[PDB]
Amino acid sequence: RTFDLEEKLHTNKYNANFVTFMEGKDFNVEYIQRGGLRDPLIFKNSDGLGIKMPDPDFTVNDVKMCVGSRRMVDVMDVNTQKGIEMTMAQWTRYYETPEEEREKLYNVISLEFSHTRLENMVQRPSTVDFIDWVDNMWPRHLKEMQYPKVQKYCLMSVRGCYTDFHVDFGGTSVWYHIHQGGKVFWLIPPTAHNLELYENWLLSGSQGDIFLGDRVSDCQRIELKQGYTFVIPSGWIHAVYTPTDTLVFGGNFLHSFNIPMQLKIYNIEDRTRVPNKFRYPFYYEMCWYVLERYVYCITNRSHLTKEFQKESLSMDLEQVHLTHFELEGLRCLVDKLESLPLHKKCVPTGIEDEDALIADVKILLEELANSDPKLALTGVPIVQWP
Numbered sequence: 275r276t277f278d279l280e281e282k283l284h285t286n287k288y289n290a291n292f293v294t295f296m297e298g299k300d301f302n303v304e305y306i307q308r309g310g311l312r313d314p315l316i317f318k319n320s321d322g323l324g325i326k327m328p329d330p331d332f333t334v335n336d337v338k339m340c341v342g343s344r345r346m347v348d349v350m351d352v353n354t355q356k357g358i359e360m361t362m363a364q365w366t367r368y369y370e371t372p373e374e375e376r377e378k379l380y381n382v383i384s385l386e387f388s389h390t391r392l393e394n395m396v397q398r399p400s401t402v403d404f405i406d407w408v409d410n411m412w413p414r415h416l417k418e419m420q421y422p423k424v425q426k427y428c429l430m431s432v433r434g435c436y437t438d439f440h441v442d443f444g445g446t447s448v449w450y451h452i453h454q455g456g457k458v459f460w461l462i463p464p465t466a467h468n469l470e471l472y473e474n475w476l477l478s479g480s481q482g483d484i485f486l487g488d489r490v491s492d493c494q495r496i497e498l499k500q501g502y503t504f505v506i507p508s509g510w511i512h513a514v515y516t517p518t519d520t521l522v523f524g525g526n527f528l529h530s531f532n533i534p535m536q537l538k539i540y541n542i543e544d545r546t547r548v549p550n551k552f553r554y555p556f557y558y559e560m561c562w563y564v565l566e567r568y569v570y571c572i573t574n575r576s577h578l579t580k581e582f583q584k585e586s587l588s589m590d591l592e593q594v595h596l597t598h599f600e601l602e603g604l605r606c607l608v609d610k611l612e613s614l615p616l617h618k619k620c621v622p623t624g625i626e627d628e629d630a631l632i633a634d635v636k637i638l639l640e641e642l643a644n645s646d647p648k649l650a651l652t653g654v655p656i657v658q659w660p
């Protein structure tokens with residue numbers, strides 16, 4: 275902590291214009307097919323989004339219950355890092371310690387609660403339910419851990435905590451709803467140039483002597499108030515600061531319209547030697563399912579084992595025009611997966627022949643090469659009914 279955060283919080287120089295303000299109603303799948311979720315969005319009203327949030331007088335304490343006290347939570351010491359020593363019990367008591375009495379500066383930005391009752395209490399925007407790689411790609415009988423359980427998040431921050439510049443794991447995109455309080459964001463776009471600066475910055479030790487926002491040409495500091503829903507696209511480098519005690523509900527997802535950046539970031543994580551602890555769980559296994567789903571949804575030719583096919587069929591019994599976004603995306607998924615050394619192709623377990631799959635994708639990618647953008651804008655993803 276060499277640079278003055280206060281300065282970075284009050285100078286009016288991060289005036290870039292990256293964020294697009296819109297109405298939740300306008301946020302549908304045709305929008306994603308049209309823009310490819312390349313812009314960070316802010317919805318002042320939750321109207322049209324299809325989200326559901328607890329009675330707003332909900333408090334951290336109300337959270338220490340639903341999840342479960344004595345339920346170890348990863349808590350970071352915004353003055354250095356880690357200290358996940360505590361559970362909700364110790365934490366809740368910390369949240370309510372008047373600022374001055376407050377000894378440490380703690381932040382909880384990892385509580386993933388889909389396990390707890392809190393789940394059916396919180397609901398993400400329906401558009402995100404349409405493109406989420408998990409709900410839509412991973413075999414459903416495996417989520418009814420052997421499935422990426424990194425979907426719903428509950429961040430709880432105190433006045434003063436600051437999360438330094440980073441790009442969310444796996445190049446995931448993220449949605450946040452400020453339930454109580456507010457947050458200040460510094461946004462930097464995944465410009466090839468910026469993404470280089472950022473990687474070199476993580477190698478030099480992410481010094482903390484340099485404010486990354488000052489290293490780039492254009493940065494936008496945004497302010498999220500109570501009630502806003504925030505969407506950050508895959509790849510963006512951002513830093514966050516909690517001006518006051520805030521409670522946020524959100525999540526990190528993967529979709530099929532910005533696959534190249536998603537892989538772009540995984541490879542940064544690979545070169546930056548990020549510990550396998552903080553890696554998106556089952557990244558490549560997921561990728562294999564994405565392809566198998568595409569081939570099956572477009573071609574009706576399944577590539578899962580008979581067993582898996584049976585479950586998918588049981589559960590149920592209870593041409594096509596792609597955007598360039600997906601065509602270029604599938605291309606990367608194919609090339610990426612092929613450049614993986616044999617022992618580490620992480621072929622999921624529900625897949626018969628990966629080669630037959632890969633062969634079928636390459637053929638699929640050439641037959642569909644000429645897709646009409648207009649005709650592609652179907653308003654609904656081709657991969658549906660997980």
Ligand SMILES: O=C(O)CCC(=O)C(=O)O
Binds near residue numbers: 436437
């Ligand atoms: O609010 C914060 O401190 C960090 C938010 C977060 O989870 C992220 O930017 O990845």
Ligand SMILES: [Fe+2]
Binds near residue numbers: 441
């Ligand atoms: Fe983030």
